[PDB]
Amino acid sequence: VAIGIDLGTTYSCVGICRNGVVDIIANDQGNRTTPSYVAFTDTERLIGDAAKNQASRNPENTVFDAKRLIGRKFSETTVQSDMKHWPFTVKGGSDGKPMIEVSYQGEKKTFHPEEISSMVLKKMKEVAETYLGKPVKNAVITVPAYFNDSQRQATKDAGAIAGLNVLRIINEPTAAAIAYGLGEQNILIFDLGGGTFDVSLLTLEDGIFEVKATSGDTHLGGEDFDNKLVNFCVQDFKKKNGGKDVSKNSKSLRRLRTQCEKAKRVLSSSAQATIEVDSLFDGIDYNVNITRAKFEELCMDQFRNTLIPVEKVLKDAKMDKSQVHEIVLVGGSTRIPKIQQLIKDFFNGKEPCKAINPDEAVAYGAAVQAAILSGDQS
Ligand SMILES: Nc1ncnc2c1ncn2[C@@H]1O[C@H](COP(=O)(O)OP(=O)(O)O)[C@@H](O)[C@H]1O
Ligand SMILES: [Mg+2]
Numbered sequence: 001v002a003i004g005i006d007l008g009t010t011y012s013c014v015g016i017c018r019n020g021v022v023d024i025i026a027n028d029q030g031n032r033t034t035p036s037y038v039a040f041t042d043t044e045r046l047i048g049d050a051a052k053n054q055a056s057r058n059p060e061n062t063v064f065d066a067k068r069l070i071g072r073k074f075s076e077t078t079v080q081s082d083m084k085h086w087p088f089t090v091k092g093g094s095d096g097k098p099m100i101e102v103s104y105q106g107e108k109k110t111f112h113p114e115e116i117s118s119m120v121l122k123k124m125k126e127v128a129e130t131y132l133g134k135p136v137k138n139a140v141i142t143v144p145a146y147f148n149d150s151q152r153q154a155t156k157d158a159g160a161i162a163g164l165n166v167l168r169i170i171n172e173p174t175a176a177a178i179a180y181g182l183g184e185q186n187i188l189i190f191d192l193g194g195g196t197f198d199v200s201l202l203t204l205e206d207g208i209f210e211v212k213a214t215s216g217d218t219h220l221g222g223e224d225f226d227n228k229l230v231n232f233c234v235q236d237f238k239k240k241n242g243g244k245d246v247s248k249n250s251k252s253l254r255r256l257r258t259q260c261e262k263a264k265r266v267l268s269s270s271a272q273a274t275i276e277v278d279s280l281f282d283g284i285d286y287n288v289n290i291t292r293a294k295f296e297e298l299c300m301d302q303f304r305n306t307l308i309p310v311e312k313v314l315k316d317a318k319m320d321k322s323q324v325h326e327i328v329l330v331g332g333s334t335r336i337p338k339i340q341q342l343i344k345d346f347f348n349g350k351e352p353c354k355a356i357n358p359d360e361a362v363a364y365g366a367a368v369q370a371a372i373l374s375g376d377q378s
Contacts, residue, residue, distance in 0.1 A: 002138035002167060002374045003128045004366025005121060006175070007155065009067045010194030010223070011332070012036050013363035014124040016132070017371035020378035022179070024360045025131045027123075033332075033359050034127065038063045038119050040104035047123040056254040059087035061102040065195070066120070068218075069098045069113035070158070071151030078218075087250075114154045118161035125162055139164045140370040142362050145171040145200050145211050167373045173200035174209045175365035176330045180353050186323050188313070190343060190352070191330035192306060193359070195221040199309040201317045201324075213316035215309035220302065222264070222333040228298040229260035229290065233275060236288055246281040256280060267292045268335045296338045303338050307346050327352040332359035 004022075006013040011033040015024040026032045029049050039051035039062040046054060055062040068082050074092030083090055089101040091110075099110040121141070128136050141164075143155050152169050159166040173189035185204040191197070198216040202209050233256055234247050246252045259275045266273035272291040280286040296303070314321055327343060329352045334340065343352060356364055371378070 001132065001134070001136055002140065002370035003125075003136055004140050004142075004175075004363050004368065004370045005124050005159075005164075006142050006172070006360075006363035006366060007067065007117060007121060007124075007158075008033070008036055008193065008359075008362070009065065009196050010036055010221070011359060012120055012124050013360050014128050015360065015363040015367035016128060017367040017376070020371075020376075022364050022367050024357070024363060025128050027127045028130075032357070034120075034123060036064060036067065036117075036120050038066075038116050040102045040109070042106060045104065045119070047119055056251055056258070059250065059254070061088065061104070063088050063100055063102065063111075063116050066100070066113045066116040069100075070117055071113075071148070071154035072098065074098045114158040115161060117155065117158040121159055121162035121164060125164060137163065137165045138167050138370065138374065140168050140170060140366045140373065141166055142170055142172045142175045142366050144196075144198055145173055145214050146198075167370060170366065170369055171200075171211060172362050173198065173202060173211065173214075173328075173330070175363075175369065176328050176361045177202055177204070177209060177365065178368050179356055179361045179365035180326070180328060182326055182328075182353075185325040186317075186319060187326050187328060188310070188324050189328045189330055190306075190310070190334065191216075191362075192333040192339065193221050193331035194333070195219070195223055197221060197306060197309065197331075199313050201313040201319065212319075213313040215312040215316070217305075217309065220306070221331075222261070224302065225264055225295075225299050225333070225336075226257055226261045228302075229264060229275065229295065230257050232290075232294075232298060233260065233286070233288060237281065237284075237286055241281075241284055244281060244284070246286075249281060252277075252281045256286070263290055264295065265335075267295050268337060292337075299338075303336075303342055306339065307342060310343075310346065321347055324350070328361070329354040329358050330361050334358045 013033045034048040035052040037051035039046040091099045093099045156166045187202040189200040197220040201213045263273035263275045277286045
């Protein structure tokens with residue numbers, strides 16, 4: 001028995017390929033993906049939905065973004081940039097590795113990034129075990145195509161810490177292509193997730209995939225679209241509440257961001273949505289209606305700029321966009337209709353591969369590869 005695990009920047013996903021078909025496994029709360037969050041409380045260690053749902057109440061001890069630190073040295077310039085985002089403490093050890101400091105059961109505990117990720121993997125493992133009713137040990141784990149040897153080995157080590165026999169580390173874009181069962185074929189993976197954007201151009205030759213070029217933006221994702229709605233709501237609240245500034249309270253903002261993300265999802269299938277927060281700031285209730293057009297308007301420049309990395313990978317691959325045989329939409333943010341419209345137009349009306357829920361495709365393909373590596377050629 002071998003599973004496929006997408007260890008995602010913001011959400012992870014686990015699937016299993018049995019008898020040639022892939023079942024993505026929902027977790028305790030019925031969610032087919034699980035937040036890559038770990039929280040420490042006076043009494044318990046929380047992972048996934050429970051961790052994220054409690055983040056606003058305990059930001060200092062709720063850890064996320066471990067993928068941004070795994071396999072890196074603390075001094076790298078990316079860590080210095082990324083950290084003004086994290087409410088949790090990160091320090092450098094003697095070896096120079098990042099140490100995530102939190103409080104757990106009234107005590108101070110430090111964890112390496114791969115130890116945090118091992119906790120997320122262990123959760124996904126248990127999710128599969130509950131669904132299967134039997135233990136699981138073998139697994140394939142995916143990583144971004146640009147991950148280096150240290151980041152990959154640290155991800156493999158996280159698997160071993162979680163009790164998993166890691167059969168192979170594989171590239172996220174190649175997993176997505178495998179999911180779709182894709183002569184030479186030029187394949188463009190457009191992966192717009194919760195915190196990151198990755199564009200990869202692949203070639204399929206004799207059933208063998210080759211990554212020809214990659215680009216993207218490590219700080220463009222759904223969360224940034226949430227923040228445009230948050231900025232709008234902060235200005236709106238000020239206009240109707242005598243200039244009171246909600247942004248000065250971190251809890252209020254986080255409560256507001258949570259509702260902005262919810263409404264954003266609604267706007268992917270409805271023409272408008274409501275953002276509602278009772279007692280948001282002071283004792284003042286907040287309520288606003290957001291149309292798809294206004295949401296699109298607020299994010300247009302960011303939506304438009306997703307195409308610049310697409311042009312770059314094609315430039316680097318010495319390839320004209322008309323030579324792309326398939327466009328694969330990965331990442332939950334590719335559910336936004338305006339994003340899909342921009343991609344299709346850029347590729348002159350070519351319909352993209354999107355039938356597989358975009359936040360599951362990576363786990364989907366990973367599970368396929370896990371089955372094949374287990375001797376199951378079904
Ligand atoms: N229907 C939807 N419309 C717009 N965005 C969505 C929708 N569903 C999920 N998302 C977004 O997708 C993101 C998560 O994508 P995911 O693929 O899990 O990210 P990652 O793989 O980087 O962890 C979140 O920002 C979330 O808001
Ligand atoms: Mg993911």
